[PDB]
Write an enzyme that holds these catalytic residues in place. Structure first.
Site, PDB file in Angstrom:
ATOM      1  N   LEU A 113     -25.230 -49.361  53.248  1.00 49.45           N
ATOM      2  CA  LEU A 113     -24.412 -49.986  52.217  1.00 49.45           C
ATOM      3  C   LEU A 113     -23.008 -50.279  52.751  1.00 49.45           C
ATOM      4  O   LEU A 113     -22.387 -51.266  52.385  1.00 49.45           O
ATOM      5  CB  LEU A 113     -24.321 -49.078  50.964  1.00 49.45           C
ATOM      6  CG  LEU A 113     -25.667 -48.879  50.255  1.00 49.45           C
ATOM      7  CD1 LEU A 113     -25.528 -47.914  49.075  1.00 49.45           C
ATOM      8  CD2 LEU A 113     -26.213 -50.253  49.827  1.00 49.45           C
ATOM      9  N   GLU A 157     -20.340 -49.109  56.409  1.00 46.50           N
ATOM     10  CA  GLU A 157     -20.099 -48.318  57.622  1.00 46.50           C
ATOM     11  C   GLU A 157     -18.674 -48.551  58.061  1.00 46.50           C
ATOM     12  O   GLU A 157     -18.237 -49.697  58.122  1.00 46.50           O
ATOM     13  CB  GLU A 157     -20.970 -48.764  58.799  1.00 46.50           C
ATOM     14  CG  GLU A 157     -22.453 -48.613  58.659  1.00 46.50           C
ATOM     15  CD  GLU A 157     -23.146 -48.679  60.013  1.00 46.50           C
ATOM     16  OE1 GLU A 157     -22.723 -49.520  60.851  1.00 46.50           O
ATOM     17  OE2 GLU A 157     -24.106 -47.897  60.230  1.00 46.50           O
ATOM     18  N   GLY A 158     -17.963 -47.481  58.392  1.00 49.71           N
ATOM     19  CA  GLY A 158     -16.595 -47.631  58.853  1.00 49.71           C
ATOM     20  C   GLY A 158     -16.050 -46.368  59.494  1.00 49.71           C
ATOM     21  O   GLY A 158     -16.675 -45.296  59.411  1.00 49.71           O
ATOM     22  N   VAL A 166     -22.345 -45.034  54.306  1.00 51.50           N
ATOM     23  CA  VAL A 166     -22.976 -44.901  53.002  1.00 51.50           C
ATOM     24  C   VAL A 166     -24.334 -45.599  53.117  1.00 51.50           C
ATOM     25  O   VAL A 166     -24.404 -46.776  53.460  1.00 51.50           O
ATOM     26  CB  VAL A 166     -22.151 -45.602  51.884  1.00 51.50           C
ATOM     27  CG1 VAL A 166     -22.908 -45.497  50.549  1.00 51.50           C
ATOM     28  CG2 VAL A 166     -20.778 -44.952  51.771  1.00 51.50           C
ATOM     29  N   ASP A 224      -6.241 -46.302  44.763  1.00 56.53           N
ATOM     30  CA  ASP A 224      -6.682 -47.395  45.617  1.00 56.53           C
ATOM     31  C   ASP A 224      -7.606 -48.325  44.870  1.00 56.53           C
ATOM     32  O   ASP A 224      -8.649 -48.734  45.378  1.00 56.53           O
ATOM     33  CB  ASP A 224      -7.365 -46.853  46.880  1.00 56.53           C
ATOM     34  CG  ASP A 224      -7.377 -47.872  48.050  1.00 56.53           C
ATOM     35  OD1 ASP A 224      -6.584 -48.865  48.049  1.00 56.53           O
ATOM     36  OD2 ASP A 224      -8.202 -47.641  48.981  1.00 56.53           O
TER      37      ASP A 224
END
Lengths: 264, 5
Positions: free
Chosen positions: A13, A15-16, A21, A121
């Protein structure tokens, strides 16, 4: 029932530089949940805050499990993806749709503020949609408690995403939490109605922000926004956080209460 | 890829 605790990770879902996720599907029931996976090589706090969340417009937390250095957080799955992807660049979206998403965002923020949590945020990329396009506030990685035992704590940490951040975070040492999230919701509203963000940041050094303070609404993105919602934005995007509209008053706003959208 | 609950 054997196997009911087995989940297959079927799709990425997100990626970073923070982990990933994945969409998980139950081996037996085929129930879908999102699983946030983090290599602990902060977490305790996000988990603590996620355990407090119970509202139809906030992603629900089901629990977590760890195996050594990896934490697995099980979260409600929002198959509609990011609100960001429903915004047409330089166009926005139909006003009634924006109004409905804005009503759901306010419900979720009222709920969070009611339990003393500020998200810090809020932006379209963190507002997810379920299969019926219901909005769900997600990612509490920057969230914190601003009210505890009925006592408010002033914030001083600079965090968020510049285009969405309130001016007081760039100009003052301490500030109240709630007006900051209200400001962010105003920028999200601008984006939904104009398909563009008004400024890189709300500082006097930013020409677009100076123009807004100078009320030059004949320029974009303001000129693409009808008068009723623009009147609400004039009350939300107010530099002095003590003069900025509060949610109870946003709920009384003319545009906020105008019938625009048919039910599904 | 899989995980347990």
């Amino acid at each position: 029932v054997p196997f009911v605790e087995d989940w297959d990770l079927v799709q990425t879902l997100g990626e970073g530089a923070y982990g990933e996720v994945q969409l998980a599907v139950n081996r037996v029931t085929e129930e879908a949940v999102a699983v946030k996976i983090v290599d602990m090589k902060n977490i305790k706090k996000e988990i603590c805050i996620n355990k407090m969340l119970n509202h139809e417009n906030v992603v629900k937390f089901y629990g977590h499990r760890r195996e050594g250095n990896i934490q697995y957080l099980f979260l409600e799955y929002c198959s509609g993806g990011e609100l960001f992807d429903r915004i047409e660049p330089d166009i926005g979206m139909p006003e009634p749709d924006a109004q409905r998403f804005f009503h759901q965002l306010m419900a979720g923020v009222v709920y969070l503020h009611g339990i003393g949590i500020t998200h810090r945020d809020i932006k379209p990329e963190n507002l997810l949609l379920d299969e019926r396009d219901n909005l769900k506030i997600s990612d509490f990685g920057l969230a914190t408690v601003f009210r505890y035992n009925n006592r408010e704590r002033l914030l001083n940490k600079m965090c968020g995403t510049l285009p969405y951040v309130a001016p007081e975070l760039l100009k003052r040492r301490e500030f109240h939490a709630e007006p900051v999230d209200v400001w962010s919701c105003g920028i999200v509203l601008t984006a939904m109605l104009a398909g563009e963000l008004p400024w890189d940041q709300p500082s006097d050094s930013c020409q677009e922000y100076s123009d807004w303070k100078e009320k030059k609404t004949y320029l974009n993105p303001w000129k693409k926004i009808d008068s009723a919602p623009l009147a609400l934005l004039h009350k939300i995007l107010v530099e002095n956080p003590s003069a900025r509209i509060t949610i109870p008053d946003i709920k009384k706003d003319r545009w906020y209460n105008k019938p625009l959208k048919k039910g599904a | 890829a899989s995980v347990s609950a």
